[model samples]
Target: GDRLGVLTTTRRVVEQAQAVWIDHDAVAQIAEAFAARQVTPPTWNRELHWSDGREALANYILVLDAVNFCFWGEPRWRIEYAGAVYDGYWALAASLKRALEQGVPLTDASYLAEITRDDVATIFAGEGEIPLLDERARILRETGSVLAERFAGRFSDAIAAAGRSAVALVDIVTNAFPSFRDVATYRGEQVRFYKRAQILVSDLYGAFDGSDLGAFDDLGELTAFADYKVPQVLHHLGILRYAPALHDRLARREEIPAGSPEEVEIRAATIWGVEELRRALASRGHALDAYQVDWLLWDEGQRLPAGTLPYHRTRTIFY
Candidate 1:
């Protein structure tokens, strides 16, 4: 269920992107990759389950887009880990060109330099800390926007785009968070930031699309696709946490008597979503080979709980 949900969302993002950018021939190539294990896994498997792969990809993409917003201040690795993987190179280049052409000043060469060809190449090659790169990407976007607005004849439009990206991202994430919270059965207002996060990401997507990107050309389609995948992704992540054995135990209210080895393992394993994605991606030929690139995902745990526990548990009962 978890994995399926994820898959649905990821497909939406990709399909929407593809619908706008790729033609029938390109879709055929991508579909072939999907079947060949190049783009995404086509069927379920023992290790990852096809759904799990989809969900991870969705979350991965969503997180990337989320971090793209300046207000979110999300980690860079999360933003850039799959940078070159998606339609990012073209998107980044286009955005940069727009900023430059519109007279966006490059006040800080160092900041822009980090997001330059070399830095982007390092990210794609998995050389540096991914999270750090994510950070750099954000800085690049933010600083670049600032300079663009200052220099551009339409400073107001630039500033508005920046703000709008944050808010739009917040909107989509907000709508999406409820489903996650339902699946995870998460409680407490503390988790409310997730709603804010969704909003910011949705807002950002809209903002960029509204800008040179032009309304994403298929916003409704993409959101619909994301909706389709959430359950599958969440299901896989949920199963890892509430395995048959774990579910039986929970149903019996047979807690591990507190602080037992079983409890320890379970506690440690709560981060299975992160572990599983890492392992899953490795199998898919996207291993986090370098320290810099890999560390970003590792560090992402600092912000959100490991695995999809809160996301899954609060949403539905394991049993």
Candidate 2:
């Protein structure tokens, strides 16, 4: 149903976008390089995650994704787990994994619903505090409360109600957690990104190999998780180009207002650019979805050259 309408809403923003545009030729070329490189598929079970079993793992994942946003700030928060240092998203993952190892009761929805800022500060204690500490804890509390009320405090049961449909899960998640409804205003229209909500399902699929709790019949219906990095990569690769004013602002590392046309266009073009890349790869006989293409682009984004364009900054709970 595309009830979240991420794919379609982003397409509309792409059509009307003024600050950003996608280059199909560049997308095709990148797709060729990716298919030729034979990029290794991403694995979620490496050492960073905490997985006890199927249902337990689902609860952990649900809790993990609830607060997965806005990790950027001065001093840069960092975490040390198992003798390894991590920043950005890995820091969150490692902190959670460490919490579970030390018996933090993260698997219990009741604990999540009642988790306080002091409790979160202890678990994520590190060199610097994460950007949105109170906000992240509040989102988790709200998510846990909803999971308790609607699905009997089990993330797996909530996911199972989707009947293996990704879109339906998006619907359920948006209805349950207000933050997951990542909709922006563009040209007087509602443009849905649903980055966190969609990535939660995508993370599940990656973690469980699309079976059990991760199973989703309509993966192709999912679009890329629009965020700062992917758009930066797209611009660096010439797949997405922004206006000179917008380019200068990002180059100066200035924060863009959330829901502004520039920010919406940047995220919108990111979603469509990955979709085009997926279509291009499929045209070359490579089987992949927008989600997989997103990972590959994300990997590419991480290793970008020194002079690449900077990512747009928006301080919001919805990455």
Candidate 3:
């Protein structure tokens, strides 16, 4: 059922575990294809977020790890980072809905559109406005201080530097990424979210450094953001998923983590989402197959790459 991919495998696993019919070979093939192609066909645009969000997501994930490691000092960081990531994912999802409704689609270009200064200000208008986030950052700062005392202050400093740098980048993205259009439109919303993304990255950095970890951490929160969080958000919303090979290549070059359980779930969901969206969009008379759609969506996601400012580069750290 459902294209003989992970869904089939998952069904087989459940069935087999209950002593039902199973095709081990077929399951192996699905896994292999997933490992090899790491993508599937869809009705709507796939890779729309992949090309766009991959960089930002990767950065976010990496930084999340760094901050986690620096602050909680290992195992603890995993849960905290995951929770933070989940929060960012939700934030992005909310922002995207706004963008799609307000932003315009650019045929020739890859990203949504320019984010204006006023839009940026509206997005981040007040940081202390959110008590929960503020508290989290405060906790992180306290923890960072502890880590610094235990380890070296340099670690704390690195965390601080990275956080500050991410925030500065966020400022640019928020203020400028959506400047190409008005605030109430779909494109404007995209611009708004892009700025939000930048802010999110910066916020993560701030959370890591501001926590007890101190300035020495260099939590790599940015990487995590670019990879895991961004991808999750895009995939969840039925955007695109690039070839796994691309991610693999990037991983090899950048020494980024790949093939973890998180990656597996994300990849599987991405494939499924693309295929479904493809089928849905087709009923509306769109020409895209899953692959084409994936690429288009990814192209959009790529332009903003976290909806930050233009100079805010993709994570070169991973590759």
Candidate 4:
């Protein structure tokens, strides 16, 4: 319900724009990809070590979502872990896994509340330095403090308080954790993205295998996360288009200001485009939601040919 309003509003706005158009032919092509099983859904088990079960796994996912932003840097931020180099999202997951293995109480709210800059640096240590070090540290501490003060130092408590509803969890997170409040103003009206907030709920759903804490009756209500990669993939797949000016700015790697019309339109268009893709798949007899389509597109974005498409860069904590 909460997600539907924002996503519907985004679709209406982008539809009126006539700038970012979703190509139906392209959507049908993607439908074929799905039917052939070429598009695979991303699994947390392959990406994270959360076999520790309920509480610990929930906390681990919570902590991971807290700082999942701005992984792009000059030449990209990288981490060397276990005889291999990982970059972007994988690097973050690998770093967290490394910290847990090395006896860092990263999932403990009390410990996270008091984590020092050096402690963060140690956990995120990598071949190349991590981007937004101070910002990430601040988010971790703030999120930890909120959990400790309100949720009794466990993420599960917060979920339980949501009455097993995903949308309710989003409200609790955006209200309780200021950092998770991904809001913006567009054309004199307030709009919500809540990228990280929605992802946290999705991760919980996946991590719990859709039972217990993850059993939300309205799982299909969630929209695409509207992050950098999804839009990039949308553009690459010919499902999303940008205005000439905006396209040029992105091609030049210009930093689009957060909450600006350009940035908001890009993000909004991404959500709308993915929703169309989901519908296109469903019409073709493939059952998939916006979140599943997002995973497929995001993974495609990651493996895209170097420099094939330009992704709009916005330096903000929202994503």
What is the number of backbone collisions in each predicted candidate, taken in the order shown?
74, 0, 104, 0
User: TM-score of every model?
Assistant: 0.23, 0.95, 0.23, 0.93
Expressed as tens digits, the lDDT of each residue in 1-319 for candidate 2 is 5665777778888998888999988988888888898777666554568878887788888888888887877798998887889988889999998999999999888998999999999999998898889998898899788878878888888788899999899898888778787898888788889888888998889789888989998988888999888888889888998889999999998999888888889899999898888888888878887887888778887799998887888999898
- Poorest stretch of ten by lDDT in candidate 1: 220-229
lDDT by residue (23-122, candidate 3, tens digit) is 3333334334343543443222222222223333333222222222111111211112222332223333332333333442211112212323343233
| Model 2 residue pairs with clashes | none
* TM-score rank order: 2, 4, 3, 1
Runs in model 1 deviating more than 4 A are 1-36, 40-196, 199-239, 243-284, 287-319
- Can you write out model 4's per-residue Cα lDDT over 1-319, one digit (the tens) per residue? 4444768677556866644667778878877777778455676563555346677778888888889887876867788888898887888889999988888888889988888788888888876678778888899999889889988888888888888777888898889999988878778776778899889998888878888877787768888998998999898888887878888888898988888888888888888888888887877777887888887788788689987667888888977
RMSD of 3: 20.6
RMSD of each: 21.2, 1.5, 20.6, 1.9
Model 4 lDDT, full chain set:
0.82
* Residue 61 lDDT (model 3): 28
- Of 2 and 4, the candidate ahead on lDDT is 2
Which digits, one per residue and each the tens of the lDDT, describe model 1 over residues 1-319?
Answer: 3211322322233232211111233323322433355432122112210112222322322323333321111122222222332222223323333333444433233344235545443433322223234544554454344333443422233323434343333343334322212122111111111322332233334334344322333222111111111222323323223445544554454433322333323322322222334344455465431111213332333355334332211111011
Two-way TM-score contest, 3 vs 4, winner: 4
For candidate 3, report its TM-score: 0.23
| Candidate 2 overall lDDT versus native | 0.86
